[PDB]
Design a protein around this nucleic acid. Structure first.
Ligand code: DCP
Ligand code: CA
Ligand code: CA
Ligand code: CA
Length: 341
DNA sequence: CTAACGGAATCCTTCCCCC
DNA sequence: GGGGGAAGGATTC
């Protein structure tokens, strides 16, 4: 295979800068205001002018303002970014019909039938970058390799407005030398689980016994890392289908009172049903985020589609079920729909 | 009514019913 | 022994 991976640079911030070019050159921070108090919330992303000083995704807004009090702080306008993203994905369809849309700013392309070698795949990456910059004035990063995992790693290496090829020779070096925490799918809890086993590179998984690795990171991640270490990973590019749609809102104050939580729950249902847009779900899940930011969920699936009225009455019964079987106060309450007709 | 923090989505694992 | 579902967990954007 020859996989071409596209990753939009600082997407949310860059879209805001395209829509307001006076933002060019300044630190821009895209925020998710929870509404509980002034500047409560987290940073969705920031451009590289702000990211260079430690303002990155996930950190609290009030911590970003202690670092950069004079940066531009904009509220997240996800529907604007989604519509811009959808147009860029339509541009990517013109280069390969095997395309896998991974997220709002990521897409894999199987270009095995469109180029002969990596030099031609490289040139196709330039043509794709120039086409996106010409149509939407958005800079992206191209990663090219023999599978999806190393194509994404390639884009991570040359990230800010770049293009990078990891050939079969560098693939083997990375199996020996790339720190295993930088492999997609290995978070801190799985990484620290590899370290305590002594595994720091992919090649280490081939010397260890399988069950000693399986019995503690799981069968799937063990097979996944072993196949990568053997240079035998080759999952195909697949069209991804949205499997669930939901919405969770932060309440103004923690509560275990039914009548106080119900307005937030009903608002989450209305917005979730608007996002359904056609699509008839057969399962509904009420999801509560407790004081300690833990996640509790109670669900129910029907032999038929779920009307909005049925979603209303069933969510209350599922919410009562959460107050019964857990005693932590709820901080965020929401709903999720799945199993579409 | 401004309080040390968002919101959304996937896949995998554990437990349990069931054949 | 294993298919299949409910709920938690880990990951990532
Ligand atoms: N914890 C996070 C991480 C990301 N995002 C959003 C903001 C990003 O614009 C988009 C894609 O995130 P990336 O991981 O691709 O990061 P960026 O595109 O912002 O930066 P980079 O240019 O390094 O990819 O997802 C978010 O809401 N919350
Ligand atoms: Ca990106
Ligand atoms: Ca991305
Ligand atoms: Ca990691």
């Amino acid at each position: 295979m020859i996989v071409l991976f596209v990753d939009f640079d600082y997407f949310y911030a860059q879209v805001e800068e395209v829509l307001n070019p006076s933002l060019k050159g300044k630190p821009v921070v895209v925020c998710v205001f929870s509404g509980r108090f002034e500047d409560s919330g987290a940073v969705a992303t920031a451009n590289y002018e702000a990211r260079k000083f430690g303002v990155k995704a996930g950190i609290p807004i009030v911590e970003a303002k202690k670092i950069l009090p004079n940066a531009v702080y904009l509220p997240m306008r996800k529907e604007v970014y989604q519509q811009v993203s959808s147009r860029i994905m339509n541009l990517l369809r013109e280069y390969s019909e095997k395309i896998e849309i991974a997220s709002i700013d990521e897409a894999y392309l199987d270009i095995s039938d469109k180029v002969r070698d990596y030099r031609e795949a490289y040139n196709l990456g330039l043509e794709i970058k120039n086409k996106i910059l010409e149509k939407e004035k958005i800079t992206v990063t191209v990663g090219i390799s023999k599978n999806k995992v190393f194509a994404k790693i390639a884009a991570d290496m040359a990230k800010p407005n770049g293009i990078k090829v990891i050939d079969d020779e560098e693939v083997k070096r990375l199996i020996r030398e790339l720190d295993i925490a930088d492999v997609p799918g290995i978070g801190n809890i799985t990484a620290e689980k590899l370290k305590k086993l002594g595994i720091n590179k992919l090649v280490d998984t081939l010397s260890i016994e399988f069950d000693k690795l399986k019995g503690m990171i799981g069968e799937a991640k063990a097979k996944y890392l072993i196949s990568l270490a053997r240079d035998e990973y080759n999952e195909p590019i697949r069209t991804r289908v949205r499997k669930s749609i939901g919405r969770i809102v932060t309440m103004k104050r923690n509560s275990r009172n039914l009548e106080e939580i119900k307005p937030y729950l009903f608002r989450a249902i209305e917005e979730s049903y608007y996002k359904l847009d056609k699509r008839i779900p057969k399962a509904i899940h009420v999801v509560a985020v407790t004081e300690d930011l833990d996640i509790v969920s109670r669900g129910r699936t029907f032999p038929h589609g779920i009307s909005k009225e049925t979603a209303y009455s069933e969510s209350v019964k599922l919410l009562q079920k959460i107050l019964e079987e857990d005693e932590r106060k709820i901080r965020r309450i929401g709903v999720r729909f799945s199993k579409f007709i």
